[PDB]
C-alpha cells in the first residue's frame, strides 16, 4: 500500500481513516514524502501535505539513534534531493522545506553533512548565473533559516563548522545583493524582494558567522559599500520614490549596524568603515532633528523617530565601551578605543551633540502635548512603561544621561547663560517655555554627575519651588513645569538633597496630590513621592507629617480615578512600599481605610481574568500591612482570613496564581498573632489541610510551607496540634523523605521536631510518643543515624539532637521504642541484600543491637565533634537522662558519661539556675531588633518557650547530674546500686568520683 494512503486519509475522514502512524517510521516513508513533494506534477495540495509530515518526521525520527529510525540509505538520498525545488517560486513550500534542511542541518552537519555551504557555493555558482532569481530567491530562504538554526547551536563545535564554512558563501550572497539592488534602483521591476532577502542573508552571516569580522576583507569591503548604499536610499528617500518599502532597505542596514556594534564596540569600530556609520547618523542626528521633533506618527509614520533612535543607540554603545573598556584582555581594547577617540569622538563633536539634544530631543513633542491634552492617564499609563528603545524623547533622555556621565563636561553654565539667555524668552507662547523644560531636563538628567558643583539644596527653594508654585501661568505651562519639578525632584533626592529640602518636597507633592486635577502631574508626583520613600536614605522621620494625608489621597483621589490596570496596581504596590518604610506610623482609622479598598479591588481582580495581577498585589499589600501593622495585625483578619481562603485554595482557578503569595500572608498572619492581644481564630486551624496539597505540589516554597507549620507548633497546644490530622499525614512524608529533604527545609522539620517536644511540657506520659512513634518520626530518627554509608556528623549530630531531647522526657519510652524498633527491622541477611547507602548497622537477627551500645557508644564520639556549648548540653543531658532507664548496656558506659561530665563540669560557669551567657550565643531574639526587625510576636512566643521550658537555661547540669545518680540509686537496688558502683571498674571509679564528688558553691 502507498500512494493513496497518504491522501485518503486526508471528524470523518481525519478522524477513521487516520491509520498511518504505522507508515511513520518506515524505511523510505520519508523520501517518499519528500519525493511528493519534489515531483511537480502532483497536486499543490499533494505536495504541501507531503513536505508538512515530512518536516515532522524529521523532527520526530531524524535521529537514527532514537527508536523508530530511518537508514543511512533513506538519510542521504533526502539530504541530497533538498534544494532540487528552489525552481518552485511558492514560499509556502520553500519556507518549510528549509526548516526541513535547517533542521536535518542542525542534526547533521560537521559530520554526516559536511559539504554543505560547500553545495550551496555551487548551487550559487550555477544559479547566479541565470535569469531564475527565483531559484536564487529559493536558495537565499533556505541559507536565511539554515544560518538561523545552526546559529542557535551552544553545544558542540556544530557552530564554529558553519562559521568556519559560511565565507565560501558570503561574497557570492553579496554579488546577488548587488546586481539585484542596481537593478531596481532606477528602474519599475520588483526584484527588490530578492536584495532584501539577501541582505538580511547578509546580517545574518556577518553576525553569527564572524568574530573579529573586521579581519575578513571581504566583510569589511560589503559593510562599507552598504553604507554607501544606506547613505543613497536616505537622499533620495526625500528625492523621487515615495514608497512604504523604500524603507525597508534603511531598517535593514540600520540593523546591521546596531546588531555588529551590539556584538561588539570593539568589532564594530575596528571596521574600516567604523566612523563613516557613526558620523552619517550623527548627521542624520543633527540635520533632520527638526523632522523627527515635528513629526507625527498618526499621519506620517515613525520613520524618522525610529532611524534618530536608531542612530542614538549606536552611539550609546560606543559611549558605553568607551566609559569602560568591557575575546582581548587587552590588545583588541588597546587600540580599537584610539581609533573612535581621535577620528569621532572630539570634543567639539561630544559638546555638539549635547546642544543638539538639548534643544530637538529634551523637548516635550508637539504630540506629546497634543495627546496629554486629551488622555492624560493613558499618556502616563504608556509611560508606566517607559520603553526607551522605542522612544525618541526617552531615549534622547537616556543617550544624554550618558554623555554626561561619561564626560567631565561641565557645560553648566550653558545652562547658566542659556537661563539667561533662551529661556528668557517667550514663556507666555510656548516655544521658548517648552526650550526651558528642555533644559530643566537636562539639569534633571545630569544629577548623577553635577552634584559637587551645584548647590541643589538653594536651588529648590531659589528657583524651583517658586515655578512650581508660580500663578503667573497659563494653567497648561503650570502642568508642564510642576511635572518638570517633581521629575527634578525625584532623580536630586537621592544624591545632594537635605532632608529639609526633603520636607519641602513631600509638603508640595501634598500640594499637588490635594490641588492638581491633571492626571500625569498626579502620577508624577506619586512615583516621585514612592522613589523618595524607596530611597535607601529615607529619613522616615521626616515624612510622617506628609504620611497620612499622601495615603489618604492615594486612596480617595489617585486610585480611585485611575481606572488602567497597571496604574491602579502602580498606586497600589506604592501603598505597600510607603507601609514598609512607616512601620511606626500608622492609625487603626488609617487601617481601615486601607481595608475598605482592599474588597472592592480584590472582587475586581478575581472575577474579570483580566485583573488576576491585582490580586498579588493586594496579597502583598495586606501582607506588609499584617508585618507593618505587627501584633495588632489580627485588625486585617476581617479581611485577610477570608482573602488567604480564596488564594490558598486548590480549587479555584487562581490557586495557580495566587496560592504562593497567599501561603506567605497566611505566615505573616501567624507570626504577628499575639494571643496577648486576641483569641486565635478558629479559622487558621480549619485552614490547615490547604497546606498538603501545597506540599505535594509546589516543593519550590516547601520551606515556606513549613514555616506556616511552625508557627502553629509554637501557638496551639500538643494536644491540638497532634490531634490535627493534616499535620500527621504531613509528618508521615517527612519522614519517608527525611534524608531527601533539602537541607533548609530539613532543618525546619527538625526544628519543628525540637518545637513541639519543648511547647509539649511533659504531661503527656505517652502523647507526643505515641504521636511520633504513629507517624514515623521515631523510626526515622533511628533509622538516618543506623545506615551503613553514615551521615556527615554535622548531620548526624542534628539528628541526635532531637533524640537527645526526647531522652531528657521520659527515657524509658525511647528505650522501649528502640526495643519495637529492634524488633521490626529486617533480617540480618536482608540487610546485607539492600543498596549502597541504605544498608544498616543493625538488624532484627542480631542482638538488642549489642544492648543499646550500637546507639549510645556512636552517640558519645558524636558528643566529641560536638562543640556548641548549648547543643552540648542538650546532648549530655539526653545521654544522662537516658542513664536513668539503669539498662545494663546503658549502665555499662557510666566510666565514659563521667568523664564528659567532668570534662564539662570543669569547663563550665553556670548560674543557680543552670543558664549561662554562652548558652545565648545563636539566641535569636536581642536588642539589635530597631534597625533590622522589631521583634514579632512569634519570636517572642519562641523565646518564652525556650526561657521557659529548655532544660538548657532553667536546670544546672551539677543537679541534674546528681539527681540522675539519685534516680539510679532508687530504680536499682540500693544493693544493686551500691554493688554498680564498684562492678564498673572500681580503681578507675575511685578515681573518676574523686573528681566528680568535688561539689563546690
Not at 112 to 124: G, R, S, V, Y
Not at 183 to 204: F, G, I, M, P
Not at 442 to 455: G, I, T
Not at 576 to 586: C, E, G, R, V, Y
Request: hydrophobic share 40%; aromatic share 10%.
Amino acid at each position: 500500500l502507498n500512494e493513496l494512503n497518504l491522501v485518503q486519509v486526508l471528524d470523518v475522514q481525519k478522524l477513521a481513516e487516520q491509520q498511518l502512524r504505522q507508515w511513520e517510521t518506515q524505511a523510505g516513508f520519508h523520501y517518499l514524502l519528500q519525493s511528493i513533494y519534489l515531483n511537480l506534477s502532483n497536486s499543490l495540495q499533494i505536495r504541501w501535505l507531503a513536505v508538512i509530515q515530512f518536516k515532522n518526521g524529521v523532527d520526530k525520527y531524524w535521529r537514527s539513534t532514537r527508536i523508530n529510525a530511518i537508514p543511512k540509505d533513506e538519510k542521504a538520498s533526502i539530504r541530497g534531493r533538498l534544494f532540487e525545488m528552489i525552481d518552485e517560486q511558492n514560499n509556502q513550500l520553500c519556507i518549510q522545506n528549509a526548516q526541513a534542511s535547517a533542521r536535518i542541518a542542525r542534526l547533521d552537519f560537521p559530520v554526516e553533512w559536511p559539504t554543505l555551504f560547500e553545495d550551496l557555493e555551487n548551487l550559487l555558482n550555477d544559479e547566479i548565473i541565470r535569469k531564475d532569481s527565483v531559484k536564487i530567491y529559493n536558495i537565499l530562504m533556505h541559507i536565511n533559516q539554515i544560518v538561523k538554526v545552526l546559529g542557535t547551536a551552544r553545544i558542540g563545535r556544530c557552530r564554529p563548522a558553519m562559521q568556519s564554512k559560511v565565507p565560501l558563501i558570503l561574497p557570492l550572497i553579496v554579488r546577488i545583493y548587488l546586481q539585484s539592488f542596481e537593478e531596481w534602483t532606477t528602474s519599475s521591476n520588483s526584484s527588490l524582494q530578492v536584495s532584501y532577502l539577501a541582505l538580511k542573508v547578509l546580517r545574518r552571516i556577518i553576525c553569527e558567522g564572524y568574530d573579529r569580522p573586521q579581519t575578513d576583507q571581504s566583510v569589511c569591503d560589503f559593510i562599507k559599500l552598504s553604507v554607501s548604499h544606506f547613505e543613497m536610499l536616505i537622499s533620495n528617500h526625500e528625492n523621487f520614490k515615495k514608497f512604504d518599502i523604500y524603507e525597508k532597505f534603511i531598517k535593514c542596514l540600520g540593523k546591521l549596524y546596531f546588531n555588529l556594534v551590539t556584538g561588539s564596540p570593539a568589532n564594530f569600530i575596528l571596521l574600516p568603515c567604523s566612523t563613516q556609520i557613526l558620523i552619517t547618523y550623527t548627521r542624520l542626528i543633527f540635520d533632520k532633528a527638526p523632522k523627527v521633533y515635528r513629526e507625527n506618527s498618526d499621519v506620517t509614520g515613525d520613520f524618522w523617530e525610529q532611524t534618530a533612535i536608531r542612530g542614538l543607540l549606536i552611539l550609546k554603545r560606543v559611549i558605553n565601551f568607551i566609559h569602560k573598556k568591557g575575546r582581548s584582555d587587552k590588545l583588541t581594547i588597546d587600540a580599537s578605543i584610539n581609533k573612535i577617540n581621535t577620528e569621532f569622538l572630539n570634543e567639539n563633536l561630544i559638546t555638539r551633540l549635547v546642544d543638539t539634544l538639548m534643544e530637538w530631543y529634551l523637548r516635550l513633542r508637539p504630540t506629546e502635548l497634543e495627546n496629554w491634552f486629551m488622555d492624560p492617564e493613558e499618556w502616563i499609563n504608556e509611560q508606566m512603561a517607559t520603553s526607551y528603545e522605542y522612544q525618541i524623547r526617552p531615549c534622547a533622555e537616556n543617550v544624554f544621561q550618558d554623555l554626561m556621565n561619561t564626560f567631565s563636561e561641565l557645560l553648566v553654565p550653558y545652562l547658566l547663560k542659556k537661563i539667561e539667555n533662551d529661556a528668557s524668552k517667550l514663556s507666555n507662547s510656548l516655544d521658548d517655555f517648552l526650550r526651558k523644560d528642555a533644559i530643566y531636563a537636562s539639569f534633571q538628567l545630569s544629577a548623577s554627575a553635577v552634584s559637587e558643583m551645584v548647590d541643589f539644596d538653594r536651588l529648590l527653594i531659589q528657583v524651583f519651588l517658586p515655578e512650581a508654585t508660580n500663578t503667573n501661568i497659563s494653567g497648561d505651562e503650570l502642568r508642564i513645569i510642576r511635572r518638570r519639578v517633581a521629575l527634578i525632584i525625584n532623580e536630586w533626592s537621592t544624591v545632594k538633597c537635605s532632608e529639609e529640602s526633603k520636607s519641602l518636597c513631600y509638603k508640595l507633592f501634598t500640594n499637588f496630590l490635594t490641588d492638581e486635577d491633571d492626571k500625569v502631574v498626579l502620577l508624577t508626583t506619586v512615583q516621585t513621592v514612592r522613589t523618595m520613600v524607596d530611597d535607601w536614605n529615607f529619613n522616615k522621620d521626616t515624612f510622617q507629617p506628609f504620611l497620612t494625608e499622601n495615603v489618604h489621597l492615594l486612596l480617595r483621589k489617585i486610585l480611585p480615578s485611575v481606572s488602567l490596570t497597571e496604574t491602579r496596581l502602580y498606586v497600589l504596590n506604592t501603598l505597600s512600599d510607603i507601609i514598609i518604610q512607616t512601620k511606626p506610623l500608622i492609625s487603626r482609622d488609617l487601617l481601615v481605610e486601607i481595608l475598605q479598598i482592599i474588597p472592592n479591588l480584590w472582587e475586581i481582580a478575581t472575577n474579570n481574568a483580566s485583573e488576576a495581577i491585582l490580586a498579588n498585589a493586594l496579597l502583598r499589600l495586606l501582607r506588609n500591612l499584617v508585618s507593618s501593622l505587627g501584633s495588632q495585625s489580627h485588625l486585617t483578619w476581617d479581611i485577610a482570613i477570608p482573602v488567604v481562603a480564596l488564594a490558598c485554595d486548590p480549587s479555584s482557578m487562581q490557586y495557580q496564581l495566587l496560592s504562593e503569595d497567599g501561603y506567605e500572608l497566611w505566615g505573616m498572619l501567624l507570626q504577628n498573632f499575639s494571643s496577648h492581644d486576641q483569641e486565635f481564630d478558629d479559622k487558621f486551624v480549619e485552614l490547615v489541610p490547604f497546606l498538603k496539597y501545597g506540599i505535594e505540589t509546589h516543593t519550590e516554597i516547601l520551606p515556606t510551607l513549613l514555616e506556616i507549620i511552625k508557627s502553629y507548633a509554637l501557638i496551639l497546644n500538643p494536644v491540638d496540634f497532634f490531634s490535627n490530622n493534616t499535620f500527621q499525614d504531613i509528618f508521615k512524608q517527612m519522614s519517608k523523605y527525611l534524608l531527601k529533604l533539602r537541607e533548609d527545609s530539613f532543618q525546619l522539620v527538625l526544628e519543628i521536631w525540637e518545637i513541639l517536644i519543648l511547647s509539649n511540657e511533659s504531661d503527656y506520659e505517652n502523647l507526643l510518643l505515641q504521636k511520633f512513634y504513629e507517624t514515623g518520626v521515631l523510626s526515622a530518627l533511628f533509622d538516618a543515624i543506623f545506615l551503613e554509608e553514615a551521615p556527615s556528623s554535622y548531620l548526624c549530630s542534628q539528628i541526635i539532637q532531637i533524640i537527645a531531647r526526647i531522652s531528657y522526657v521520659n527515657p524509658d519510652a525511647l528505650m522501649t521504642f528502640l526495643a519495637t524498633y529492634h524488633d521490626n527491622l529486617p533480617t540480618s541477611n536482608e540487610n546485607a541484600r539492600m543498596p549502597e547507602s541504605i544498608r544498616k548497622i543493625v538488624s532484627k537477627d542480631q542482638t538488642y543491637d549489642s544492648v543499646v551500645n550500637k546507639l549510645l557508644t556512636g552517640w558519645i564520639v558524636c558528643f566529641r565533634d560536638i562543640f556548641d556549648p548549648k547543643f552540648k548540653k542538650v546532648h549530655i543531658l539526653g545521654i544522662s537522662s537516658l542513664l536513668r532507664t539503669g539498662l545494663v548496656p546503658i549502665l555499662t558506659e557510666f566510666s565514659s558519661i563521667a568523664s564528659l561530665w567532668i570534662e564539662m563540669l570543669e569547663e563550665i560557669n553556670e548560674t543557680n539556675r543552670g543558664d549561662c551567657e554562652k548558652y545565648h550565643l545563636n539566641d535569636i531574639v536581642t536588642e539589635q531588633s530597631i534597625a533590622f526587625h522589631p521583634l514579632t510576636a512569634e519570636q517572642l512566643r519562641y523565646h518564652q518557650l525556650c526561657k521557659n521550658n529548655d532544660p538548657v537555661h532553667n536546670i544546672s547540669l551539677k543537679d541534674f547530674i546528681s539527681q540522675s545518680m539519685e534516680y539510679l540509686e532508687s530504680h536499682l537496688g540500693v544493693e544493686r546500686y551500691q554493688e554498680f558502683l564498684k562492678t564498673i571498674n572500681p580503681s578507675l571509679l575511685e578515681n573518676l568520683q574523686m573528681f566528680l564528688s568535688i561539689q563546690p558553691q
